[PDB]
Amino acid sequence: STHEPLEVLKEETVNRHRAIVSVMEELEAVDWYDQRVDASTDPELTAILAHNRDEAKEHAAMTLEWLRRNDAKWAEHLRTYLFTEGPIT
Amino acid sequence: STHEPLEVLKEETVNRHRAIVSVMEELEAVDWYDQRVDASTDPELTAILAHNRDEAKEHAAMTLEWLRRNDAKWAEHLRTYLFTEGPIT
Amino acid sequence: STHEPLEVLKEETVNRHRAIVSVMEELEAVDWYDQRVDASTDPELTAILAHNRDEAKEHAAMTLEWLRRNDAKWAEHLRTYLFTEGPIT
Amino acid sequence: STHEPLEVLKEETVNRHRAIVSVMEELEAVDWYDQRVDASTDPELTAILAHNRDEAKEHAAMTLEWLRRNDAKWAEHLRTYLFTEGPITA
Amino acid sequence: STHEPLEVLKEETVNRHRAIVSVMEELEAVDWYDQRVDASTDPELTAILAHNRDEAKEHAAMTLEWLRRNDAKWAEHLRTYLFTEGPITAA
Amino acid sequence: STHEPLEVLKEETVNRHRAIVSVMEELEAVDWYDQRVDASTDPELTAILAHNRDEAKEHAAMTLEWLRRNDAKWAEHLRTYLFTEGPITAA
Amino acid sequence: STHEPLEVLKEETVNRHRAIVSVMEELEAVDWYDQRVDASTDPELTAILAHNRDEAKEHAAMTLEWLRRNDAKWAEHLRTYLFTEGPIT
Amino acid sequence: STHEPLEVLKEETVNRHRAIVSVMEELEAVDWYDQRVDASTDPELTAILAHNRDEAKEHAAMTLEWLRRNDAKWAEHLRTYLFTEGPIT
Amino acid sequence: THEPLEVLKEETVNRHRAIVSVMEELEAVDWYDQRVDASTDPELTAILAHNRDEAKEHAAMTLEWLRRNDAKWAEHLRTYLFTEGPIT
Amino acid sequence: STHEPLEVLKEETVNRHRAIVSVMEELEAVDWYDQRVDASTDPELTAILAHNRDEAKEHAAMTLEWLRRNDAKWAEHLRTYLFTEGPITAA
Ligand SMILES: [Ca+2]
Ligand SMILES: [Ca+2]
Ligand SMILES: [Ca+2]
Ligand SMILES: [Ca+2]
Ligand SMILES: [Ca+2]
Ligand SMILES: [Ca+2]
Ligand SMILES: [Ca+2]
Ligand SMILES: [Ca+2]
Ligand SMILES: [Ca+2]
Ligand SMILES: [Ca+2]
């Protein structure tokens, strides 16, 4: 799944790759589920989709915390912006 | 770029979609630049890749804070896990 | 995301499409997470990956039950084969 | 077709991957056949498409049962939700 | 799924399109199932994969017959080569 | 092109893979050409596209006969459905 | 199949697009068949693959001639290079 | 980028593969550039797109000539159809 | 385009046409250069190398168009192109 | 991610591949961000998308300068066309 041969990648880079691709996939599921929630015409399906959507958000947050704890720039940049109140830029 | 027709999607669902795909694309850049930092045999190139990598993390962090502020479950789940101690699970 | 124009599709066919593609995406996550569990060299990440894997199984099971309740041949075939003993064929 | 190198995967993981990808592909045929069934304007084709659709559902059910027999969490989560009444999110 | 807009396609062209992509997908399943059958190390799964494989061949054959009945050049070319005996590049 | 590593695939499985992906690719061409035949506004091009469409049908037919000769379930199911009359799903 | 909306494309541009992608698809078949001919271990299959390879070349040549007749600079550049002797550059 | 293992491919097959994919990519650029030419509303951009378009045609023609010189059936079939009059089929 | 053309400004769409063109020429530059290294036929190698370097030229032309038509492209290309010393 | 085997590629070819795909990806982000900037109906998001858009341009320029320094034909052609006046096709 990597762009460079594993041969040249440090173990920490590959573990971070595993986490990053996990966040990406959960983010995608969040988005597609939210779209289906809006478009669904069956309320029983809509409740299932909306539930799965919100657990995908939890999966992403758990993996993002792992990245925060194992990558200094992630911790630094996440600390600057997350859980703030003023204008983001 | 959306999976359901825009006509059935709420405005704010589409704006969250724009933010989520942005975070996904910045996450992909972080992973790919990080792999290329490891594999590059040109130090001047490596310094550029590393700089771009870490700015992609900042772009992800800003856009993520926007998601947190505009989605009740992103705020709940991010609050649960980010900058915590002890087992993420 | 549909192969035929929404004008010619029954509303229920589109709802079933929303469910099928959700299950497919959950199955993909189960598989990918399980492969990352085997390959991970960080025990914390492995624990997150395994947790997300097993919740993806739950999401699939939930959505599959919706299909079962909303499609006569899913109900027939799932009842023939699930929770059985002896050769599946 | 695996995302991690086969050297690091347990044999059982790779066999479950084979089953999972099989279920995914049968589900996709189910969805596409059903959409084609709605859109077809040839009755003889529609009958073939609907026949193939419903056998794809059967292939998926067979492979899902194998997964249930070979994975404790699949067996648990399928047990909880399949063949129930009432809200699924309960 | 079509490469040209539906407005310019004849209805029968679109029906043949539906038949063709079905056959393609059944063929893809035949091939992947057979590879997984070779590679599987679990005999219970292998029996399932092989059963699904051969049912996919049936799905392809059924849809192929529909194409044969609804397209004269399919009928011509399938008649030239199927169920023959000699070298195939000569019939 | 294979979904499992070559070192676990039997040679005959890989040859059938080569034949199957060939039929799939010719089928794709038949469909795409036929759609372009409907949409084209230049008659000289249309005649070329149709010629190519129908030669793609022949390529698929030749390769299908190889499959029939090299796989007993292809032989069985194709014999059941090709060149028949009456409902296809009842043969 | 077009990258710009059909309503802004001239009709001649769309016909050339039909021809160009046909040549591309036939070129791909020539290449893929030639690789399979080299790799095949069944002589009866190989003869079929090679027959189809060389017909895909004929299809490409035919379609390219239509393009040549319908595009002034296809005609000019093909006339410059085809059927020459000496370094192509 | 080849479909069969390089170990079983003949040297000439791999070189023709490099030439064929090059012709394919130049043809694609001709088509996409021509579509952008029709749709562009900036005259300076349009001039660049058309200029690059006609050079991609020259690149394809050069590479096709190499194929003609290095493949007897390309030579036969191009000779049959290129620079002719009357019905191509 | 990733958003509907009806919500996009006309200049935005023209910059899209330019950006995707540069991207496709860059990809050709990269693929041609890899093929130049791997080619075992001398006349082919010369064609690939010629096509490679013309794609670079196409990219340069289309980038200049962007520079003339986007103030941030002009600023950032002015900051870094043709400089001495560390790029970061 | 290379199309030829790494064995046969010169090291500078692989490093230029790393630079080129980086530029492509930053360019893609410039384009997608700008289209999202046009289409966004939330001004706080728009400000983020637009800031990110303009930093992608800087990333592209930095990497392009590296290519210019490491490739004579990039240096030649960029010198011909960048920061000029008049018809671009003629300089
Ligand atoms: Ca605070
Ligand atoms: Ca990207
Ligand atoms: Ca996914
Ligand atoms: Ca499929
Ligand atoms: Ca056998
Ligand atoms: Ca094809
Ligand atoms: Ca023929
Ligand atoms: Ca391209
Ligand atoms: Ca125009
Ligand atoms: Ca030039």
Residue numbers in the entry:
A (entry chain C), B (entry chain D), C (entry chain B), G (entry chain G), H (entry chain H): 7 to 95
D (entry chain A): 7 to 96
E (entry chain J), F (entry chain I), J (entry chain E): 7 to 97
I (entry chain F): 8 to 95
What does the paper say about this structure?
Our study reports on a new class of ferritin-like proteins (EncFtn), which are associated with bacterial encapsulin nanocompartments (Enc). By studying the EncFtn from R. rubrum we demonstrate that iron binding results in assembly of EncFtn decamers, which display a unique annular architecture. Biochemical assays show that EncFtn is active as a ferroxidase enzyme.
Through site-directed mutagenesis we show that the conserved glutamic acid and histidine residues in the FOC influence protein assembly and activity. Analysis of each of the single mutations (E32A, E62A and H65A) made in the FOC highlights the importance of the iron-coordinating residues in the catalytic activity of EncFtn.
